[PDB]
Amino acid sequence: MENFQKVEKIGEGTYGVVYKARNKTGEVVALKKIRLGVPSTAIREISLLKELNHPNIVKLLDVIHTENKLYLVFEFLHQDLKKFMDASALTGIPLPLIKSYLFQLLQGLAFCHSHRVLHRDLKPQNLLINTEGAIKLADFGLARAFGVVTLWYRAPEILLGCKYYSTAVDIWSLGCIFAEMVTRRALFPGDSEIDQLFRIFRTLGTPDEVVWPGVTSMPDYKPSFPKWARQDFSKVVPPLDEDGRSLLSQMLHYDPNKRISAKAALAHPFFQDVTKPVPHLRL
Numbered sequence: 246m247e248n249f250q251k252v253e254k255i256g257e258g259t260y261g262v263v264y265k266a267r268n269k270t271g272e273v274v275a276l277k278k279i280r281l282g283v284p285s286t287a288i289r290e291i292s293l294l295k296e297l298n299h300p301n302i303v304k305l306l307d308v309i310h311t312e313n314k315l316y317l318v319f320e321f322l323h324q325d326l327k328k329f330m331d332a333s334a335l336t337g338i339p340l341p342l343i344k345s346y347l348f349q350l351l352q353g354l355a356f357c358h359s360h361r362v363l364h365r366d367l368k369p370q371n372l373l374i375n376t377e378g379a380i381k382l383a384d385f386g387l388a389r390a391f392g393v394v395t396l397w398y399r400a401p402e403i404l405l406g407c408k409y410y411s412t413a414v415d416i417w418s419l420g421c422i423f424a425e426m427v428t429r430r431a432l433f434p435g436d437s438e439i440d441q442l443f444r445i446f447r448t449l450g451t452p453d454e455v456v457w458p459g460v461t462s463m464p465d466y467k468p469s470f471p472k473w474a475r476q477d478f479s480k481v482v483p484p485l486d487e488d489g490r491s492l493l494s495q496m497l498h499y500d501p502n503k504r505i506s507a508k509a510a511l512a513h514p515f516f517q518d519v520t521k522p523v524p525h526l527r528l
């Protein structure tokens with residue numbers, strides 16, 4: 246721990262402060278001080294995460310439990326998708342690069358999901374990019390590990406009070422990010438839980454028992470919810486092509502059981518001509 250020299254503060258998450266740091270191995274790392282001894286379950290869960298290694302998952306290099314505090318040492322990347330989106334706002338991310346990033350994030354999700362590990366908190370600031378065209382998921386497994394946060398990417402079954410949600414929650418979040426790369430605007434930018442739900446309802450239709458069996462018995466479902474009609478995706482994500490719109494529609498299925506899995510999404514015709522472009526990055 247005295248083994249690291251802070252370089253600068255680079256971020257601030259739900260789980261504490263993040264610094265760029267140098268390991269006195271020579272390596273440059275992202276160091277996360279976990280907000281706080283450490284409960285023993287958090288330890289064994291995080292220890293499990295160190296083994297969950299994939300090219301599209303930010304590598305957990307080390308887990309330092311000392312002085313009764315917890316530090317997570319991560320592989321360092323120089324940019325995130327939020328900043329890249331803000332920088333690309335004038336002409337948009339080119340479609341082939343959108344498709345490459347979506348494809349790679351679905352590979353990362355299919356990996357974690359096959360081990361029954363969920364992210365739960367996907368958002369642009371958690372997706373990190375390098376000069377080689379790679380994109381990686383940061384903070385995977387941390388929500389389960391530890392128990393204004395953005396609601397924009399939160400799945401409707403969470404907002405409706407489901408306690409035992411599934412890997413489908415990460416697919417919803419990724420479809421929301423896909424729509425945002427395409428249109429250069431957040432799809433559902435809610436500033437309260439009801440505003441988030443009602444934005445979803447205004448675009449996708451108020452869900453009912455027809456499209457989502459069991460919806461009306463959910464913990465926070467209210468029969469008094471206004472009933473809005475569903476919009477056409479051609480209005481929601483222009484100028485995305487029909488393969489893209491078709492894939493997005495399956496990622497945004499109301500019923501978590503009908504929503505497409507990461508593994509099935511990888512086979513969708515949208516990915517038939519996928520390539521790996523390199524972005525233009527100013528670091």
Ligand SMILES: CCOc1ccc(Nc2c(C)c(N[C@H]3CCCNC3)nc3ccnn23)cc1
Nearest residue numbers: 255256257258263275319320321322323324325
């Ligand atoms: C171009 C300046 O922007 C940057 C600069 C550095 C980063 N790097 C970074 C940042 C900012 C980061 N921040 C965390 C903050 C809390 C939520 N999850 C991500 N985590 C990691 C892990 C590996 N790299 N990294 C991201 C964006």
